[PDB]
Amino acid sequence: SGEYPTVNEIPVGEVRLYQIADGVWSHIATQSFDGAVYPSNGLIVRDGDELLLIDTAWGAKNTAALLAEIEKQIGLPVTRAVSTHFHDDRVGGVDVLRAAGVATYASPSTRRLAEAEGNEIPTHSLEGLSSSGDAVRFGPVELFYPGAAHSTDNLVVYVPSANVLYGGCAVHELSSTSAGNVADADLAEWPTSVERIQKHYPEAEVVIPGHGLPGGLDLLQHTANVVKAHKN
Numbered sequence: 293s294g295e296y297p298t299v300n301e302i303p304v305g306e307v308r309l310y311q312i313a314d315g316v317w318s319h320i321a322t323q324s325f326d327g328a329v330y331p332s333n334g335l336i337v338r339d340g341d342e343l344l345l346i347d348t349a350w351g352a353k354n355t356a357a358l359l360a361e362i363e364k365q366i367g368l369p370v371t372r373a374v375s376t377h378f379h380d381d382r383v384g385g386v387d388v389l390r391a392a393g394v395a396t397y398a399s400p401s402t403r404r405l406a407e408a409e410g411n412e413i414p415t416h417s418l419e420g421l422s423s424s425g426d427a428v429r430f431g432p433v434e435l436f437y438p439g440a441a442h443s444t445d446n447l448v449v450y451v452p453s454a455n456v457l458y459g460g461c462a463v464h465e466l467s468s469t470s471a472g473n474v475a476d477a478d479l480a481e482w483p484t485s486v487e488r489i490q491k492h493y494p495e496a497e498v499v500i501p502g503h504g505l506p507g508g509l510d511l512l513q514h515t516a517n518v519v520k521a522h523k524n
């Protein structure tokens with residue numbers, strides 16, 4: 293009924309949308325992994341009379357549900373999708389998208405890592421993102437590669453019309469107590485990568501983590517803080 297929806301409020305398989313700003317929504321879904329249930333976020337950005345999708349809903353059935361929810365709540369076609377790193381909460385559902393007419397994109401790094409992991413693989417490569425600090429435009433967003441953090445390939449997304457920073461899994465929510473799933477992380481580089489985000493997007497008004505509640509710019513410093521203590 294208006295609050296950001298939380299892990300225990302979303303059955304696995306259902307998707308909710310949350311209006312962030314004019315023409316910007318997050319999508320929230322839940323999934324099981326190793327016997328525990330987790331929420332995860334993605335983004336939807338209006339692109340004229342079409343939509344740009346950032347990240348899948350963590351699985352094929354969740355991603356089908358996402359498309360249905362978009363049709364119900366927004367009613368514009370999803371034409372392109374970007375996955376912000378190679379893990380299943382970002383690419384699981386790409387095959388659903390591709391069969392629903394969506395053109396799927398990721399960096400070449402993400403595509404290689406996805407392929408090697410046995411995850412679904414976006415069709416199109418995003419060049420121009422291979423060095424930290426790189427940025428490219430993609431419809432109504434800027435894509436930015438901050439350096440290695442939660443993964444070596446993680447991208448962040450900025451919506452300049454709304455000053456919305458989608459951090460993906462490089463950014464954690466304020467309630468977080470550790471750095472989440474660090475299996476593929478670079479804990480030592482992560483603070484430097486977060487500092488690059490802070491320097492590049494100082495006017496961000498909303499910051500959306502890969503998992504959990506949006507907030508403001510404090511999510512960046514909080515992330516640095518939890519990562520440094522996890523490394524230690």
Ligand SMILES: C[C@@H](c1cccc2c(-c3ccc(CS(C)(=O)=O)c(F)c3)c(C(=O)O)[nH]c12)N1C(=O)CN(CCCN)C1=O
Pocket residue numbers: 325330379380381409442461464465467468469470471472473474475476502503504
């Ligand atoms: C799909 C993804 C994954 C699986 C399960 C959980 C997560 C998490 C995760 C965990 C805890 C918290 C709470 S907290 C910040 O307070 O700790 C959180 F907010 C996110 C995050 C996240 O942190 O992004 N991701 C998760 N995932 C990986 O990330 C690595 N991996 C193994 C495969 C190796 N290639 C895998 O399955």
Ligand SMILES: [Zn+2]
Pocket residue numbers: 377379442443461
């Ligand atoms: Zn991940």
Ligand SMILES: [Zn+2]
Pocket residue numbers: 379381461502503
């Ligand atoms: Zn994640």
